[PDB]
Design goal:
This is part of a larger assembly, with chains A (150 residues) and B (52 residues). Chain A is of the alpha/beta class. Helix content of chain A is 37%, strand content 17%. Chain A contains six helices and five strands; from the N terminus they run ααβαββαβαβα. The chains are: A alpha/beta (150), B mainly alpha (52). The structure holds three RNA strands. Chain B: Belongs to the universal ribosomal protein uL4 family. Chain B: It comes from Chaetomium thermophilum (strain DSM 1495 / CBS 144.50 / IMI 039719).
Chain lengths: 150, 52
RNA sequence: CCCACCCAUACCCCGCCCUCAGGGUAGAAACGAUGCCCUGAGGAGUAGGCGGCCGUGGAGGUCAGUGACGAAGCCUAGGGC
RNA sequence: GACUAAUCGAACCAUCUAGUAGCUGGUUACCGCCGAAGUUUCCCUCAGGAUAGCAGUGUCGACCUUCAGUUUUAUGAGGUAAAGCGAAUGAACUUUAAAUAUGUAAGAAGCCCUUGUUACUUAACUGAACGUGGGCAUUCGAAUGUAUCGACACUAGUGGGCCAUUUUUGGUAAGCAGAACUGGCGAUGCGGGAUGAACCGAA
RNA sequence: GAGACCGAUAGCGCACAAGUAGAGUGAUCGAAAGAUGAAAAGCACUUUGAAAAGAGGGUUAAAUAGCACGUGAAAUUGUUGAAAGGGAAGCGCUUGUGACCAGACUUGCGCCCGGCGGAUCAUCCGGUGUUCUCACCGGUGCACUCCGCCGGGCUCAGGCCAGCAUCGGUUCUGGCGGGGGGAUAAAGGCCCAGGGAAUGUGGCUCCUCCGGGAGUGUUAUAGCCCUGGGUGUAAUACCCUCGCCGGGACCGAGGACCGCGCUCUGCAAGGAUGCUGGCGUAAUGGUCACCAGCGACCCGUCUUGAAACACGGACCAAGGAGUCAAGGUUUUGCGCGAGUGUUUGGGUGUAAAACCCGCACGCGUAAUGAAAGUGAACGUAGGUGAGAGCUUCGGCGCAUCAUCGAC
């Protein structure tokens, strides 16, 4: 016998999505290839967040994007691996280039009306395969009723 | 695919240590001591050794 | 006090199973990528917790499925996984 | 307290009614991965409760910072053995110093200096506290090990059991009775003690 | 009129002369029980029996369907066949015997000759299709070219069990040649020079049983002990160590090459090949029954810490116990998103489906207070320290945490 005071630890992170979305499966295959064949940490972060569940992908609004676009970030490509929502409190949308998992209809319309560009994550992989000149944004994770009641 | 003991397989010993053939050839495991007449044990050493 | 000897699921070497971990795999002559290849470690278990599979009655789809030249059921010191 | 259709300290029939039980009994395929526990702390006890601790699944965060039932070093406790008193003095003597285990501490997240304030404190701008600025990366300041991280969420059993070595406190005619740590068992097969909850070896 | 309901121990108690038969004075209680065959064709006739029935012989597609009737399981029983048994059997590991079996194999592919039978040989031309350079179809082959078939020969690969040789991996065991160390072993032999003694050799003396005793004294007609020296760096033991040669056992994972190497025409170097024999079937292997050696308590359940006690279990078949609804909560998937929810209802329909519509309403978008009421930006929605990612390499800094501020 071998005395094992310590225990070998099985993985406590997602290795694959629980979702059955076929397009998400194709995106996961593409970003698995990118994370394997590139040095860019952006690709690994994007792959890991593609694995994530919905409460771990809180929505990001246009006002949050506009806040993070200030101070030299106006020309960077905004990357969100959640839903980009519209904020009607923001009356003037700045010109921006946003790549997201999905957009609401009003957010897409307001970005295109302000003159920015809307992309999917496979288009982001085509144009910035190393994540160059990107601004990676996450939504407020703790802004949930369950988290308030914890 | 298979660990081979270099103490039994002479090819593996030559792979790990190219000086093994020179060791065996020059017989460095059978080096004789330097010549010269050995001085005898001093008398006081034997007296202390056999002292009751 | 000394020499040799006997054998445990313990220890050493080797094979096989499973689990865990770490790697490789697209200008695809290219893959049940939910796959395949390489390497290492580990294996008792009540209360309890989790995962994967097997089986039964019925429903949708499908196999241009089986069947009076014998369906289902039943018996079987007959076999295969 | 007899008898009232084999029914009587309150007959028989149907219904409410599938009445209630904390007590008894039972509770249905396989394999794989983990895997336990008995005063910790509080509450008036028994016909008592929570609660710490120990477990499993999910995740997430830079799985980042390192940490550790261990030794060493410095210093405590145990000065207790011991050596000497041609050192002084006389376990209570001391230059020196035991064994077993044992507390505390051992870095850049650190150390020191300087400036002010103080509503602390001090005779006191004095200490200390709070800020301010600066210096110290020339080695980041023992060893050994390090698939050993952290934070949530949800779920589950057990939470005043038995035996034993040691330490300690009491006792008896003799038995013995309390605590503390540790190990084992309840949950566990194997080799040996012919045999077997508590023995030896080994999981 | 229907069903993602039940299928005769189910479904109503009742699929049947079922609220019947039966029970109770009565109020009331209350079952069991479906299936020959397509058609009775439900066995003429003969024979044995008192009869029931039996045997022949028909009927049938089938009586292995005979009004005991579709199928006909188990418990349990009879006969036949095989086997075991000295106060239980059953079970596990492993042989053996007997009985009974599943595979595998029967030859394949490829070259060289000879004999046939045919031209869907190569090239070129035209048409068509394609992946746009590859193919298909028609003409040309005129037989040293293609395609089949038949006879020979040869190589390779082929089933089961084995033997030997050369290797690799692991391991057990025997022998041999060297090196080093210590008091450069200690001893010991043979010499040299000193010293000494008794369990005193020779000699001498005295007693005897004539066998031997006693005494004296230092090598003599034996020897011993102690010290120092030489041979001598002697040998050997013990310990440590470098190699060499045998004898035996178990195993052969992988499957083009790649690598590290070496003794380099090649190899023992990132894992077994080569040669040979018998057999080709129950021979190997497997299943069942039994004997033999060793191993092996009767299952739940309860209790406590555990045992013991206690309780349940004669046997077999069929049922037989964490379900549904409402309301929470956390997590997973999905749609839309500051909104979201068509289905109370209306429209429509191939009619309980599907499709479509919208007012209100619910929840969310604002909180706080008992209430009256009031009601969220000093600042690029603040400062500081961390922080993934990005960066023009100066910094920008997500989520999140800590702290100080603002409303």
């Amino acid at each position: 016998g071998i005395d094992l005071r310590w225990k070998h630890v099985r993985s406590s992170h997602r290795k694959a999505p629980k979702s059955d979305n076929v397009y998400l499966k194709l995106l996961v295959k593409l970003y698995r290839f990118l994370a394997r064949r590139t040095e860019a940490p952006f690709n690994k972060v994007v792959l890991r967040r593609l694995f994530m569940s919905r409460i771990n992908r809180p929505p990001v609004s246009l006002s949050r994007i506009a806040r993070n676009l200030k101070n030299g970030n106006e020309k960077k490509t905004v990357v969100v691996v959640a839903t980009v929502t519209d904020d009607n409190r923001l009356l003037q949308v700045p010109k921006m280039e946003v790549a997201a998992l999905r957009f609401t209809a009003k957010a897409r319309a307001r970005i295109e009306a302000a003159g920015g560009r809307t992309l999917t994550l496979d288009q982001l992989a085509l144009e910035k395969p190393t994540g160059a000149n990107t601004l990676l944004l996450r939504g407020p994770k703790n802004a949930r009723e369950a988290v308030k009641h914890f | 695919v298979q660990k081979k003991n270099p103490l039994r397989n002479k090819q593996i010993m030559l792979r790990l240590n190219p000086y093994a053939s020179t060791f065996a050839k020059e017989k460095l495991g059978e080096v004789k001591a330097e010549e010269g007449k050995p001085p005898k044990v001093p008398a006081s050493f034997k007296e202390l050794l056999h002292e009751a």
